[PDB]
Amino acid sequence: MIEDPYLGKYVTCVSARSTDKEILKKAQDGGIATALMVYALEEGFIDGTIVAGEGDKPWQPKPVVAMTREDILKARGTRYNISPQISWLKEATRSFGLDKVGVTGVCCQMQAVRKAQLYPINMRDVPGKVAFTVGLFCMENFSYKSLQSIVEDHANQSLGSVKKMEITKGKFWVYTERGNVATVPLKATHKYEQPGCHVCLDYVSNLADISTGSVGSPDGWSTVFIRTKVGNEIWSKAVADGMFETKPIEEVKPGLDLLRKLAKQKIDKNQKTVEERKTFGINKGLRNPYA
Amino acid sequence: TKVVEISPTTRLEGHSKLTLKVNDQGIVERGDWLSITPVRGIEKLAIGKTMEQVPKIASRVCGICPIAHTLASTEAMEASIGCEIPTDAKLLRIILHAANRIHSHALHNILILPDFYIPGTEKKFNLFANEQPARSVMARIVRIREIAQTIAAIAGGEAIHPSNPRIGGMYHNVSPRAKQKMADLAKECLVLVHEQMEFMLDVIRNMQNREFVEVGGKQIPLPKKLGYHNQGVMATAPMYGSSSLDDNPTWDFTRWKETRPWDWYMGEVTIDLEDPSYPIGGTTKVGTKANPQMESCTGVPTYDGQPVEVGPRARLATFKNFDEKGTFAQHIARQMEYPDCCYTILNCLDNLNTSGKVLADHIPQGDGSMGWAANEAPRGSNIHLARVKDGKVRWYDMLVPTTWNFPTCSRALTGAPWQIAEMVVRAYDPCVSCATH
Amino acid sequence: TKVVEISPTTRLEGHSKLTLKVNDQGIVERGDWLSITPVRGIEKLAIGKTMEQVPKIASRVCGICPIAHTLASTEAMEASIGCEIPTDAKLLRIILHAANRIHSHALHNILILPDFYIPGTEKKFNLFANEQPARSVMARIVRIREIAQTIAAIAGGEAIHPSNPRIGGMYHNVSPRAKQKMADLAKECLVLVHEQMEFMLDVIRNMQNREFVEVGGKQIPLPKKLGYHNQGVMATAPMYGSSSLDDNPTWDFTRWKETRPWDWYMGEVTIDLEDPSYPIGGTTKVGTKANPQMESCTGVPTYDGQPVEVGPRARLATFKNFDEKGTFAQHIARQMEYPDCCYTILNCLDNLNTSGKVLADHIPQGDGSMGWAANEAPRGSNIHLARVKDGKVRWYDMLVPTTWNFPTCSRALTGAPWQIAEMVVRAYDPCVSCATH
Amino acid sequence: NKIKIGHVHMSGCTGCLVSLADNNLGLIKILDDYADLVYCLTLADVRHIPEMDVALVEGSVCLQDHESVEDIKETRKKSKIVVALGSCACYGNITRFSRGGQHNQPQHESYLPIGDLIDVDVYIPGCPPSPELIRNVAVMAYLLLEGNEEQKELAGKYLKPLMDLAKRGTSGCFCDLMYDVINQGLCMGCGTCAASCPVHAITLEFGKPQGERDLCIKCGSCYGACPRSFFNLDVISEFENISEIIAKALKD
Ligand SMILES: Cc1cc2nc3c(=O)[nH]c(=O)nc-3n(C[C@H](O)[C@H](O)[C@H](O)COP(=O)(O)OP(=O)(O)OC[C@H]3O[C@@H](n4cnc5c(N)ncnc54)[C@H](O)[C@@H]3O)c2cc1C
Ligand code: SF4
Ligand code: SF4
Ligand code: SF4
Ligand code: SF4
Ligand SMILES: [Fe+3]
Ligand SMILES: [Fe+3]
């Protein structure tokens, strides 16, 4: 175990990408989140998983319980607006009849799952049926109207043409299907962030079985934390089964040094906000969920 | 009274001249702007031809606005035979229409800017010259028109003389890729036309604050009411048009009548005032006889018994009660039409089903009933009227925007220094091949 | 060019500011008037709620014009589900609507008179002060608004946030006594509004003959074309409104599109011109950064791709071809609307059957179809659009008059001395809580 | 000596100000004799919040709007008596339902009544608030600050229940009638709640309140008006005398 104060508790950290070439075609990064859920399904570690499927408007995610490789793959790619993944967490154990639920999502959604496992409040059967969680790194998120405003105005792109979006190197990047690229400085995007993200003290999905993201690894590759016993069993067996290319993270640029720094900026900035809440008013303050 | 004549006019489409009676100060008392473009006679040669051919011939009336004649002619045939085209065909036609309006208004920027001043200076725009700001402006205009023609080619089959329109809808729907491409281009175009529009409005506003302009070395005073006329306006839509298939058509054929130039133009005059220094090549020689009634090549359509103004200003006055008139008001209203074109294209692409039908399942052959269609061409209401029987055109008539504007502009010439009569003319964005057909 | 900023504006409803680029004489070159009122987000919070609740929430967008949102929202729901309300419900709604227009126009008299002069003098109206003529004028205005609110309470259940409107008509018809009371009050009100109207028109006419006004001790010249813009106007009725249930609706949703402030507002600027003597408290400090594109709290609805003016002048221009424009023309047109309100109330009472039904026998639950309703609020066209399915709002959109007027007023600021930009603004009778919702 | 009164407009609809103005010549009487309006963006050109004896504050506070948060803090600093005017200021009202996501400020998501950010001395609940209540509070505030001891005693007794409401909390709903009246063994079926509800969300079934919770806009009126919320017998039993006193103070 490593007990990093900004990267959470983990056993190891590698740089990885799926060896499944079909998965990689539309994966955001290394295809880790898709590849792990597909593999867990084929191996019987899960019988279904909650993923950010395609929704009713372009680039709007819709949470869905996926129970086939095909349905899991439909959720490839980052949607930078809210996907209420946990809304299907109980239902997966009811009408879907699952015994071994997988869950994908960002840090706060990983938090929601663990709170439900330990303090189930009208969440019967959920603590014992969560089987496998994969958490994405997340700096901040946006409402759908925010995402529309950023892509359509600031990047000047039609949503119906966008093939990929990416926040990296200080910019919001928009890639179109016909091959064009547009960028927006992140300074322009700040007004649009979901306000509840400003109180979030978790960057690399500390509470997931396995955590995965982009920062620290080259393009096409993911930085992966293997954290829990569940996480280590599944990762070991998938590596052994040929499912991933890996590199120790210390042999990779920018690697864990850049990552630990961005994690620190996130927590530091948000801890400050958390603190300003206490004296937000005159002789009174706002609620602190962490108190 | 003296008579001065400018022949030919320039920086407009096609071939016309100005035959002007002026007072002792050189101010127009009564001026006639008239077509002297040969009459190719599209209305008469159409008789007996197939309803499929006639719109493709009518297209070749004009290569700046062939969309206008292609659509107005096709939809006149559809109105005569009672053919209702599919939704996705209509959406593709509107995309074609809006794109062509962009390219046309931007081409007209090229023609009128040489008369205009770099704001706050005494320098006029020379768009040929590889200097700033002209070259940066030319680059924007050129990209705008390129985008416009590209969209027109994709949705209409061809930018000049679109091939996709046919009786009953379109030959082709577009691919998912093509739909993305048109959207990508419209997004780029919208930013550019917003920039060009603000640029042009500033240039125009500078013109309205000037007191004189320089023509051929001389200072020419700028009247405050330059280009004012009392004919009012006519328009059938802010964007697309109307046809006799509509539940409530927005054009009234009982209010229309067309005369010869006879009723509205001057008879024989003799030129007794000549200026060899008029740039570049002078005016008509003293002693030349002119006869606008006999030399005008157009008919004169009227509405409620009088000439009317058509075009962008007519549209904004009819549909938003735009309340400025004359030369610079016409220029302003034209620029204001830039963004609607891109928003319309984007909305139409959004609703377009690329798997949808584009050709009516049944195309009737007609029984000789009259139908009509109005297309709001970039220069104004383009109204085609037809009787189709057994698939053949038995009767055809074309009331084209510049045809309408010829007698109206003429009356608007009163009060102008004859040396800027051409500026009054160019605010109408004339298409004399259109006007004459 | 320098940048001066007035924040906040005053003597209008709600919270906005003026970010102004001015020439070396202090004349606005390009000004942005923008909402900085927080977005309560009524359109998004409506989704999933019941069609009965949403109009009562929308009412609370604004307490000067809650009738506008109550009626436009209710009638949008009725249009989506296909519910035809009974005649006597419609008559009671029109009485409610007309009464509220009286109270609103009279409240606006209170806000604008401090900028105006007692005719033929250099004294401005101070309506607080217990002196003449101000106190006599205040007494008339106060009685006018009292009558108006009383009628509104009787026909609408409540003067502010009327309670009687419901999906399908009204909760209550009124008693024979109530009908007599409303008539008695309208008779009294008609005499008073005729007096107030003639008083206001005289004050305005005196303003049009002035050459300067005094702001903060200094003489500020009054441009002849103060507040002129080239956006034209939009209006759906002279009195009540229109909805997609009508045989011939008088608003065209295919001509509407809403953008972010992005397309129409200035980006980042820095304030480099400050006047601490601007009454009372000065202007924004030098060095302050502003960004209208990002700070504006509204969307920008457009008609034919351009901002439009809505409101009384828009109504008289659309329906009577009223042909004056700008600041004092807007003030005039608003006053001219006083008598129609009382004549309408009296005619509606005359036709009202106090034993008549006020609730449709059947209220459908909707299938997700889109409906829309336009209410001609005191400040202009208030258009609500909705999809109701199974009694719940699945989609909701609000295009409110001051939302429309924000970009249009902005453009109208050109040419004004920045010290009277607020006078241009107040002729629009702005409701910034309305505009933002 | 006239007291100094401001109207502060937070995230409100201005209907609270309209309600004040709907006292008609009563308002002008108060402005003539008892009070100077030192601040009100809707009616006067004072651009910044000055010192006030009484701040009538309408609307709630958007947490994501910096100027708004500064305004409500500045208001408490500048004012002797802070009045939450109307249900948005008291209880959040329709802004409880705000949840962001709308142009052009999709982050404008969170709204709280003013009592969650500053200390509030007096509630005037209602949506819309009744003109008569706003008038009574203005008159009594004056008497509390410029009267003889007999007046300042009356004023303090009159305002006490409105001050108690401010100390009770910042929430208003149909449920108040359940939680604090019916569930407390206090409801006696008078039906007053039903008359006060501005949206007709309350009916009485066999003499007992029935709330259409998805119609209720959370204004807190019904509990306020209920005669088993507060019933201060010392004041209300003297209704004839207190009415005559208020009338005389408005007389010409
Ligand atoms: C708001 C958001 C912010 C992020 N910020 C960062 C960051 O700052 N640094 C960094 O390194 N990585 C960040 N990521 C993660 C990164 O963008 C990729 O999502 C991650 O690397 C997974 O890529 P992959 O190839 O392994 O997954 P893929 O194989 O492409 O599969 C996509 C996975 O992402 C899930 N998913 C996609 N969109 C959402 C969504 N809105 N909400 C919940 N789950 C979703 C899907 O269920 C699926 O599990 C962010 C992701 C999101 C949604
Ligand atoms: S920053 Fe935190 S609260 Fe916001 S979406 Fe990401 S993990 Fe959730
Ligand atoms: S309490 Fe009601 S009337 Fe007062 S500001 Fe809030 S919505 Fe308006
Ligand atoms: S107002 Fe009357 S009926 Fe309503 S809760 Fe109070 S005591 Fe019960
Ligand atoms: S039930 Fe009616 S009075 Fe009571 S809080 Fe709800 S809306 Fe207000
Ligand atoms: Fe012809
Ligand atoms: Fe809106």
Token pair, residue B252, equals 């009234």
3-state secondary structure of C288: coil
**CA dist., res. B156 & res. B152, Å (int):** 5
Asked if the bond preceding C8 is cis, omega within 30° of 0, the reply is yes
Residues D145 and D183 in one domain: no
**CA dist., res. B15 & res. D128, Å (int):** 70
In this complex, is the C-beta atom of A80 within 8 Å of any C-beta atom belonging to chain D?
no
Residues D47 and D1 in one domain: yes
Closest CA to C424 of C279, C296, C326: C326
Q: Is D127 annotated as a binding residue?
A: yes
Residues D139 and D181 in one domain: no
Query: D15-50 burial, b if ≥16 CB within 10 A, otherwise e?
Result: bbbbbbbbbbebbbbbbeebbebbbbbbbbbbbebe
- Sequence-distant (≥ 6) Cβ neighbours of residue A240 within 8 angstroms: none
Token pair, residue B333, equals 């209203």
Does residue D75 line the site of ligand 3, with CB under 6 A?
no
Q: Which of D121, D143, D170 is the last residue of a domain?
A: D170
Residues A133 and A164 in one domain: no
CA distance C67 to chain A (A): 29
From ligand 5's centre to the CA of C65, what distance in Å?
21
Residues D206 and D221 in one domain: yes
Closest CA to A243 of A75, A66, A70, A32: A32
Counting atoms of ligand 2 from 1, which one is nearest the CA of A197? 4
Helix (H) or strand (E) holding A93: none
**CA dist., res. B413 & res. B390, Å (int):** 47
Give the number of the ligand closest to the Cα of residue D228.
Answer: 4
**CA dist., res. B105 & res. B141, Å (int):** 10
Half-sphere exposure of D33 (CA within 13 A, CB side): 15
Mutate to test the pocket of ligand 4, among D173, D175, D176, D181 (most ligand atoms within 8 A of CB): D181
**CA dist., res. A55 & res. D195, Å (int):** 45
Residues A178 and A234 in one domain: no
How many folded domains does chain A comprise?
A: 2
Does residue A84 line the site of ligand 2, with CB under 6 A?
no
- Residue whose entry in the numeric block shows the structure tokens 């927006």: A184
Token pair, residue D122, equals 């007096």
From ligand 5's centre to the CA of C363, what distance in Å?
24
Residues D99 and D194 in one domain: no
Does residue D127 line the site of ligand 4, with CB under 6 A?
no
CATH number of the domain that residue A170 is part of: 3.10.450.750
Using alpha carbons only, how large is chain C's radius of gyration in Å?
A: 22
Q: Is D62 annotated as a binding residue?
A: no
∠ Cα C269 C273 C277 (to 5°): 135
**CA dist., res. C157 & res. C149, Å (int):** 11
**Atom 7 of ligand 1 has which residue's CA nearest to it?**
A138
Closest CA to B328 of B200, B202, B215, B226: B226
> Residues B4, B16: contact at Cβ < 8 Å?
no
Half-sphere exposure of B368 (CA within 13 A, CB side): 0
Beta pairing partners, D203: D210
Cα-based distances in Å from C363 to C51, C168, C243, C388, C420: 11, 6, 17, 12, 51
| Chain A residues in contact with chain B using a Cβ-Cβ cutoff of 8 Å | 152, 156-158, 160-161, 176-178, 180
Q: Which of D131, D153, D170 is the last residue of a domain?
A: D170
Closest CA to C310 of C376, C241, C385: C376
In chain B, the domains with their CATH numbers are 1-437 (1.10.645.10)
Pairing of strands D52-58, D3-9: parallel
Residues D224 and D235 in one domain: yes
Kindly give the residue spans of alpha helices, DSSP state H, lying in A32-118. Answer: 32-43, 69-73, 107-118
- Residue whose entry in the numeric block shows the structure tokens 């200021």: D89
Token pair, residue C168, equals 């399908």
DSSP state of C162: -
Domain extent, residue D57, equals 1-170
Residues D21 and D64 in one domain: yes
From ligand 4's centre to the CA of D205, what distance in Å?
12
DSSP state of A153: I
Q: Which of D25, D47, D98 sits opposite C41 (nearest CB)?
A: D98
Q: Which of A190, A220, A251 is the last residue of a domain?
A: A190
- Sequence-distant (≥ 6) Cβ neighbours of residue C38 within 8 angstroms: C297, C436, D11, D62, D64, D65, D68, D105, D108, D111
Instruction: State whether the Cα torsion C389-C392-C395-C401 is positive or negative.
Output: positive
**CA dist., res. A90 & res. A109, Å (int):** 14
In this complex, is the C-beta atom of D24 within 8 Å of any C-beta atom belonging to chain C?
yes
∠ Cα C9 C15 C17 (to 5°): 45
Method by which the coordinates were obtained? X-ray
Strand blocks (E) in C135-240: 165-166, 169-170, 212-215, 218-221
3-state secondary structure of A254: coil
**CA dist., res. C11 & res. D90, Å (int):** 25
How many folded domains does chain D comprise?
A: 2
Cα-based distances in Å from B184 to A175, A176, A177, B180, B187: 12, 9, 10, 6, 5
> Residues B172, B363: contact at Cβ < 8 Å?
no
Q: How many CB pairs under 8 A join A and C?
A: 7
From ligand 2's centre to the CA of A86, what distance in Å?
13
Mutate to test the pocket of ligand 5, among D96, D127, D222 (most ligand atoms within 8 A of CB): D222
Query: Is D233 exposed, middle or buried (CB count within 10 Å of its CB: 0-12, 13-18, 19+)?
Result: exposed
CATH number of the domain that residue D159 is part of: 3.40.50.700
**CA dist., res. C39 & res. D108, Å (int):** 6
- Sequence-distant (≥ 6) Cβ neighbours of residue A17 within 8 angstroms: A24, A29, A30, A31, A32, A220, A221, A222, A244, A245
> Residues B223, B416: contact at Cβ < 8 Å?
yes
Query: Is B106 exposed, middle or buried (CB count within 10 Å of its CB: 0-12, 13-18, 19+)?
Result: buried
**Atom 3 of ligand 5 has which residue's CA nearest to it?**
D197
**CA dist., res. D170 & res. B77, Å (int):** 70
Asked if the bond preceding B55 is cis, omega within 30° of 0, the reply is no
Phi, psi of B169 (to 5 degrees): 150, -110
- Sequence-distant (≥ 6) Cβ neighbours of residue D98 within 8 angstroms: C40, C41, C45, D108, D109, D110, D111
CB atoms within 10 A of CB C223: 17
Q: Which of A152, A175, A190 is the last residue of a domain?
A: A190
**CA dist., res. D11 & res. D109, Å (int):** 12
Closest CA to C306 of B182, B321, B145, B111: B321
**CA dist., res. A13 & res. A211, Å (int):** 9
Query: C58-77 burial, b if ≥16 CB within 10 A, otherwise e?
Result: bbbbbbbbbbbbbbbbbbbb
Asked if the bond preceding A232 is cis, omega within 30° of 0, the reply is no
Length of chain C: 437
Counting atoms of ligand 4 from 1, which one is nearest the CA of D181? 5
Point out residues after which chain B has a gap (C–N over 2.5 Å). Answer: none
Give the residues surrounding ligand 1 with Cβ less than 6 Å away: A 27-34, 51-52, 61, 75-80, 83, 85, 104-106, 136-139, 141, 212-215, 222
CA distance C126 to chain B (A): 35
Does residue A212 line the site of ligand 2, with CB under 6 A?
no
- Sequence-distant (≥ 6) Cβ neighbours of residue B228 within 8 angstroms: B325, B326, B412, B415
Pairing of strands A12-18, A222-226: antiparallel
Domain extent, residue A136, equals 1-142+191-291
Check CB contact under 8 Å for A176 and B181.
Answer: no
**CA dist., res. D93 & res. C40, Å (int):** 12
**CA dist., res. A47 & res. A132, Å (int):** 10
**CA dist., res. D215 & res. D201, Å (int):** 6
**CA dist., res. B321 & res. B308, Å (int):** 16
**CA dist., res. D235 & res. D216, Å (int):** 30
CA distance C167 to chain D (A): 13
Task: Starting at the earlier edge strand, list the strands of the sheet with C392-399.
Answer: C241-243, C367-377, C380-389, C392-399
Kindly give the residue spans of alpha helices, DSSP state H, lying in B157-243. Answer: 176-209
Q: Which of D170, D200, D232 is the last residue of a domain?
A: D170
**CA dist., res. A58 & res. A82, Å (int):** 13
Check CB contact under 8 Å for B180 and A156.
Answer: no
Check CB contact under 8 Å for C130 and D111.
Answer: no
Residues A153 and A53 in one domain: no
Check CB contact under 8 Å for D43 and C111.
Answer: yes
Beta pairing partners, D46: none
Instruction: Compute the CA torsion angle C134, C135, C140, C141 (nearest 10 deg).
Output: 60
- Give chain D positions within 8 Å (CB) of A280: 63, 69, 117
Query: DSSP assignment of C19-69, as one string?
Result: EEEE-TTSBEEEEEEEE-S----HHHHTTTSBTTHHHHHHHTT-SSSHHHH
CA distance A156 to chain B (A): 6
Check CB contact under 8 Å for A195 and D100.
Answer: yes
CB atoms within 10 A of CB C410: 30
In this complex, is the C-beta atom of C294 within 8 Å of any C-beta atom belonging to chain A?
yes
**CA dist., res. C22 & res. C27, Å (int):** 5
Residues D74 and D191 in one domain: no
Residues D109 and D13 in one domain: yes
List CB-based neighbours of ion ligand 7 within 5 Å: C 398
Check CB contact under 8 Å for C260 and A191.
Answer: no
DSSP state of C306: B
- Sequence-distant (≥ 6) Cβ neighbours of residue C246 within 8 angstroms: none
CA C262 to chain centre: 24
Q: Residue type at D182?
A: I
Closest CA to B71 of B378, B432, B430: B378
CA distance A29 to chain B (A): 25
Best C257, C258, C289, C294 member to test A by mutation, with max A CBs in 10 Å, is: C294
**CA dist., res. C9 & res. B1, Å (int):** 58
Closest CA to B432 of B18, B5, B93: B18
Closest CA to A222 of A55, A53, A23: A23
Query: DSSP assignment of chain D, as one string?
Result: --EEEEEEESB--SHHHHHHHTTTHHHHHHHHHTEEEEE-TTT----S---EEEEEEESBEETT-HHHHHHHHHHHHHEEEEEEEHHHHHH-GGGGG-----TT-TT---EE-GGGTS--SEEE--SSPPHHHHHHHHHHHHHHHHS-HHHHHHHHHHHHHHHHHHHH-S---TTHHIIIIITTT------HHHHH-TT--EEEETTEEEE-TTT-----HHHHH-TTT---HHHHTTHHHHHHHHHHHH--
Phi, psi of C367 (to 5 degrees): -120, 15
**CA dist., res. D161 & res. A83, Å (int):** 46
Name the packing angle between helices C327-336 and C176-209 (round to 10°).
150
3-state secondary structure of A255: coil
Best C45, C260, C298, C397 member to test A by mutation, with max A CBs in 10 Å, is: C260
CB atoms within 10 A of CB C362: 9
Check CB contact under 8 Å for A158 and B183.
Answer: yes
From ligand 1's centre to the CA of B364, what distance in Å?
57
Residues D141 and D185 in one domain: no
Instruction: Compute the CA torsion angle C337, C342, C344, C347 (nearest 10 deg).
Output: -160
Check CB contact under 8 Å for B323 and C232.
Answer: yes
**CA dist., res. B288 & res. A204, Å (int):** 89
CATH number of the domain that residue D249 is part of: 3.30.70.20
Query: DSSP assignment of B72-133, as one string?
Result: HHHHHHHHHHT----HHHHHHHHHHHHHHHHHHHHHHHHHHGGGSB-TTSSPBP-TTSS-TT
- Give chain A positions within 8 Å (CB) of B186: 158
Residues D206 and D233 in one domain: yes
Helix, strand, coil % in chain B, rounded to nearest 5: 40, 20, 40
CA distance C262 to chain A (A): 7
Residues D164 and D179 in one domain: no
Check CB contact under 8 Å for C146 and D102.
Answer: no
Name the packing angle between helices C66-81 and C134-156 (round to 10°).
30
Long-range pairs, C133-138, Cβ under 8 A, ≥24:
C137/C113, C137/C196, C137/C199, C138/C110, C138/D28
**CA dist., res. C46 & res. C334, Å (int):** 32
CB atoms within 10 A of CB C374: 30
Closest CA to B140 of B336, B338, B337: B338
Token pair, residue B161, equals 């003389």
Check CB contact under 8 Å for B187 and A178.
Answer: no
> Residues B362, B261: contact at Cβ < 8 Å?
no
Residues A148 and A240 in one domain: no
Residues A164 and A265 in one domain: no
From ligand 2's centre to the CA of D92, what distance in Å?
27
- Residue whose entry in the numeric block shows the structure tokens 């320039």: B10
> Residues B343, C257: contact at Cβ < 8 Å?
yes
